[PDB]
């Protein structure tokens, strides 16, 4: 039959589905453990502010930045937090090195059921990026609308 071009989500091809699910679970667990070891101790607090900035949302942001090879403006300072960060960094290095080794080959595989990369092979990432931009705009607008309504209700 006709050759089957890779799907719109072919960027997930290099890793199996179980690997992706385990990566999601590991990311959630790492963020939760980082937040717990960073904020649970009452002796890490000072009306009172924590010594570190690693809340649950900030822990998730730090873990996502570490996995994306980008980084953020914060970094763990405690011993246990730094252990979590280092082990997550090692996991990220291994997994990303495995994933990015042959990404283009998975993006341009032909199946029956060298050349430059075409826009058709990477259209899915563009679609996801534009969808994320739209979602962020909608979330910001919703928050603005909510705050404006609350301020108006307070005024009258």
């Amino acid at each position: 039959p006709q050759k089957s071009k890779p799907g719109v989500f072919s960027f997930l091809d290099p890793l199996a589905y179980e690997i992706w699910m385990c990566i999601v679970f590991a990311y959630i667990g790492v963020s939760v453990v980082l937040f717990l070891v960073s904020r649970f101790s009452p002796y890490e607090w000072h009306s009172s502010e924590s010594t570190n900035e690693f809340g649950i949302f900030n822990s998730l942001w730090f873990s996502l930045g570490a996995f994306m090879q980008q980084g953020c403006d914060i970094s763990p300072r405690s011993l246990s937090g730094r252990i979590v960060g280092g082990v997550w960094w090692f996991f990220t290095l291994i997994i990303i090195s495995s994933y990015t080794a042959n990404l283009a080959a998975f993006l341009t595989v032909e199946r029956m059921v060298t050349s430059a990369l075409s826009l058709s092979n990477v259209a899915g990432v563009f679609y996801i990026l534009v969808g994320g931009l739209g979602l962020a705009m909608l979330v910001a607008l919703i928050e603005f609308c909510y705050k404006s309504r609350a301020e108006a209700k307070r005024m009258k």
Partner: protein
């Protein structure tokens, strides 16, 4: 200046809207091999294809968005992409959003006491730019689905996207400055 910013925003919005309308209407999007009756150099747009040289110059054809292919083993993603390209819903949506942003600009000119109209215009312009990006990606992906070139209608669309993003930035800045002035007046 508020007046200078208003003039620049209006001029940019009109320019982007006109560029998008011209790009959608015109049929000089692509230069490639093809036929114009019922394999020569041919310029095609979103709707029509016409050969620019040969014995059939001028007389030309509608694009067969759903050609008489084998019709067997056609993925639903392929059909979705083909339908989206055939409708050209994203370039038309970009045109509509640019027109709505211009209407918001005019209304804010007539309704200077209301500040959310500037924000609405900025949101419309940014959304029009995003829709244009999606339309360009869809058009290129459908085309790829061997020597070709891009005409001036494609570049008109790209310029319209850039100008729309610039005008959205200007409108957001205008909204920010108006709210800053309101806060300064209330505080003082």
């Amino acid at each position: 200046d508020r007046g200078v910013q208003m003039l620049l925003t209006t001029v940019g919005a009109f320019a982007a809207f006109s560029l998008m309308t011209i790009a959608v209407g015109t049929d000089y999007w692509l230069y490639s091999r093809g036929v114009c009756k019922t394999e020569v150099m041919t310029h095609s747009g979103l709707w029509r294809t016409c050969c620019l040289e040969g014995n059939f110059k001028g007389l030309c054809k509608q694009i067969d968005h759903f050609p008489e292919d084998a019709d067997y083993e056609a993925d639903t993603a392929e059909y979705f992409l083909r339908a989206v390209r055939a409708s050209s819903i994203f370039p038309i949506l970009s045109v509509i959003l640019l027109f709505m942003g211009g209407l918001c600009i005019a209304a804010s000119e007539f309704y200077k006491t209301r500040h959310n109209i500037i924000l609405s215009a900025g949101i419309f312009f940014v959304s029009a730019g995003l829709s244009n990006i999606i339309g360009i990606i869809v058009y290129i992906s459908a085309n790829a689905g061997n020597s070709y070139s891009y005409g001036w209608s494609f570049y008109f669309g790209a310029l319209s996207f850039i100008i729309a993003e610039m005008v959205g930035v200007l409108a957001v800045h205008m909204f920010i400055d108006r709210h800053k002035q309101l806060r300064a007046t209330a505080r003082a």
